[PDB]
Every structure is written in structure tokens, then in C-alpha cells.
């Protein structure tokens, strides 16, 4: 954080109507980019459509991902066999504490991390024979290692700084959650208390339960996105029936000036 990360996926037997290869691009927790092999164009997402960009910004994104499309689809040929295969890549960068770029280049096969790009040697490496086979295929493709080096060491940090400058407001966005605390009957003698946080950003948020002002744990929680890129969270706690009104929930979130106490409805 704040990272610029590309999430790349290829599948060797895509379902009809779905892409063999697709990419989502992320600025921290926000999706800024979409790309798939059926359309062949990198596109901005959401608020980033209105970002003021340098000339040829999205043309350069498209060029880079078309190259990665070919490389990913070529990787299946190096494995042979029927499969099916999923190849994933996590490529990108983040600014370190001394304001320089820190690269990320990891890959997984059928959900298992198995390969990385070594930026010192400029080579793909991994212990599995599948890693060696794909590495060798990529390593002997015309200047693919050099383009990967440039993508990670130059293009990514340049793009990240551009977005940090031109989209600073989008990334500093703070929307406080709407809160609800409700109880429902459960097993005999027991109720489930649920504290829910609606439509907030950034995603970092804490929910805590109190029983008579005293800490009663965090409960069992989960979190997810909404369709606009805001977020949702909830935490639930099993309590004794008839004891529900001794409890409250506390939320901590950057959109709020102080932790907010939430009382039972």
C-alpha cells in the first residue's frame, strides 16, 4: 500500500462466452482497470474513467496486456497435455519507505504458487518442472524478460505515481459506514447479535462487541465489496436469550472522528 497490482488469469479451457485470459488492475483496494482476451482492450473502471491522463495512457496499458496475453496462453503449450490449467500472475509495484519502487512478480498454477520473476538475474524461477518449462519458454521468447523488467521497474512505478498524483482524491476518499445492530432468535435460550457496517471506504474497519461497557470480543466477522467499490462488513455473536440489551457494538473507521457506539435496535 499503496500498490499498483495487476491480477492476471489464463485458463486453458474457458467456458463458452468467457475469456481465455483476463486482467484486473488495482490501486490499493480499488479496481482501476479491466482487460479480457475477447475484447482485447484495457479499459478504465468506475471513477478512473474520468481521470485526467497522459496521452496514450490506455493504449500503452492495452499493448502491455496483449503481450502478457500471448505469453500466458503460450505457457499452456509448454506444459503439454490436456489439462485443464489455470495460470495466474500477480505483477506490480509499491513505493517503499525511501520513496522507491518495490516490485511484485509471482505466479500460480492451478491455484498453487509456483513461479516468480527474479529481477536481479532477469529470469523466471521456481522448483517445479512446470515452472522450469514455462520459464524456459518465456526466457527464450524474443525479449520477454526485458519487457518484464521494464514493466516492473519502469512502467508500473511511473503509472503508480501518475495515478497517485492525478487521482489523489479518489484514493483519499473516506465514506463512513452506516451501522445497524440487531438480534435474532437462535437455539433455545440463545440469540445471535449481528453488527453490520454498510457502504464504507476504505476497507479497513474494526467491529467490537461490549457487554455492559466491558470488552466481549470481536465476534465472528466477514467482509465484502459492494458493486460501486465501497465495502460491507458484519460481525455476529451468540448471546444468551434475554441478555441482548446488555450488549453494544463499537465501530472504528477512518470516516468517523472517533469510535462509534451502536445500540441494539
Amino acid at each position: 500500500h499503496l500498490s499498483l497490482l495487476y491480477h492476471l488469469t489464463a485458463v486453458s479451457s474457458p467456458a463458452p462466452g468467457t475469456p481465455a485470459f483476463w486482467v484486473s488492475g488495482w490501486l490499493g483496494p480499488q479496481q482501476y482497470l479491466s482487460y479480457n482476451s475477447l475484447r482485447g482492450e484495457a479499459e478504465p473502471c468506475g471513477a478512473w474513467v474520468w481521470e485526467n491522463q497522459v496521452s496514450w495512457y490506455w493504449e500503452k496499458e492495452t499493448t502491455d496486456l496483449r503481450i502478457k496475453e500471448k505469453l500466458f496462453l503460450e505457457a499452456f503449450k509448454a506444459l503439454g497435455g490436456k489439462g485443464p490449467y489455470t495460470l495466474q500472475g500477480l505483477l506490480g509495484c509499491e513505493l517503499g519507505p525511501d520513496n522507491t519502487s518495490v516490485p511484485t512478480a509471482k505466479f500460480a498454477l492451478n491455484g498453487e504458487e509456483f513461479m516468480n520473476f527474479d529481477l536481479k538475474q532477469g529470469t523466471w524461477g521456481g522448483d517445479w518442472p512446470e515452472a522450469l518449462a514455462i520459464s524456459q519458454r518465456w526466457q527464450q521468447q524474443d525479449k520477454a524478460a526485458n519487457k518484464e523488467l521494464t514493466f516492473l521497474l519502469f512502467s508500473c512505478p511511473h503509472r503508480l505515481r501518475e495515478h497517485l498524483e492525478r487521482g489523489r482524491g479518489n484514493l483519499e476518499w473516506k465514506e463512513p459506514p452506516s451501522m445497524r445492530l440487531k438480534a435474532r432468535p437462535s437455539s433455545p435460550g440463545f440469540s445471535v447479535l449481528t453488527c453490520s457496517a454498510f457502504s464504507f471506504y476504505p476497507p479497513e474497519l474494526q467491529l467490537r462487541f461490549l457487554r455492559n461497557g466491558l470488552a466481549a470480543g470481536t465476534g465472528q466477522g466477514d467482509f465484502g465489496p459492494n458493486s460501486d467499490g465501497s465495502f460491507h462488513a458484519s460481525s455476529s455473536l451468540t448471546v444468551k436469550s434475554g441478555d441482548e440489551h446488555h450488549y453494544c457494538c463499537i465501530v472504528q473507521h477512518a470516516g468517523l472522528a472517533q469510535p462509534l457506539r451502536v445500540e441494539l435496535e
Binding site: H7, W26, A108, R180, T194, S196, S199, P225, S234
Partner: protein, 99 residues
């Protein structure tokens, strides 16, 4: 490897009877990426349902958001029906309005 999906169902804003809203079915943690998701209204499949891109987490498992515009009422029940290779039958998860 295969990983079975976690399934969450929640609205975008707190549910208020008669006020337009969005109902979300968030599926996450699954592998491989082929997945089928339907939103149900009192058991009937909802036609006008949209979805995010298929993305994935640091642990490489995929996630995906399905959503539909809706107006909750006192008696209408909603659910999310998910099929995936890890499942012996489609899993149905009812929307808990509290969640």
C-alpha cells in the same frame, strides 16, 4: 487444487421496506474459477442480475460479486444459489436482512 466458495449475501445499504437498494451475493475463496451464481426472489431466479469481474486474492483464490437492484419488503425472501465443482449440489444461502 480445488477450494470451495464462501458465500455472503447482504444489501448495499441498510434494508428499509419500500426503499430501492442493491442485493449482493459475494462469492470468494474458490478454485477453479468456473462458478455459477443465481439470485432468487422467494425461490424464483432473478433475471436482471449483474456481476463484477472475476478477480483473486493474495492466496490466489478467486472472488466475484453478483448484484441486483431491488426494493425489499416485509415478506419477500431472497437467496443466492451457487454451483461449483467442489459442491455435491448447488448451495443456497438465504439473505439475512441483519447481515
Amino acid at each position: 487444487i480445488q477450494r470451495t466458495p464462501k458465500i455472503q449475501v447482504y444489501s448495499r445499504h441498510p434494508a428499509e421496506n419500500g426503499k430501492s437498494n442493491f442485493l449482493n451475493c459475494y462469492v470468494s475463496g474458490f478454485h477453479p474459477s468456473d462458478i455459477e451464481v443465481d439470485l432468487l426472489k422467494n425461490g424464483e431466479r432473478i433475471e436482471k442480475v449483474e456481476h463484477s469481474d472475476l478477480s483473486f486474492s493474495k492466496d490466489w483464490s478467486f472472488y466475484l460479486l453478483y448484484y441486483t437492484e431491488f426494493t425489499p419488503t416485509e415478506k419477500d425472501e431472497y437467496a443466492c444459489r451457487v454451483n461449483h465443482v467442489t459442491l455435491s449440489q448447488p448451495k443456497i444461502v438465504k439473505w439475512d436482512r441483519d447481515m
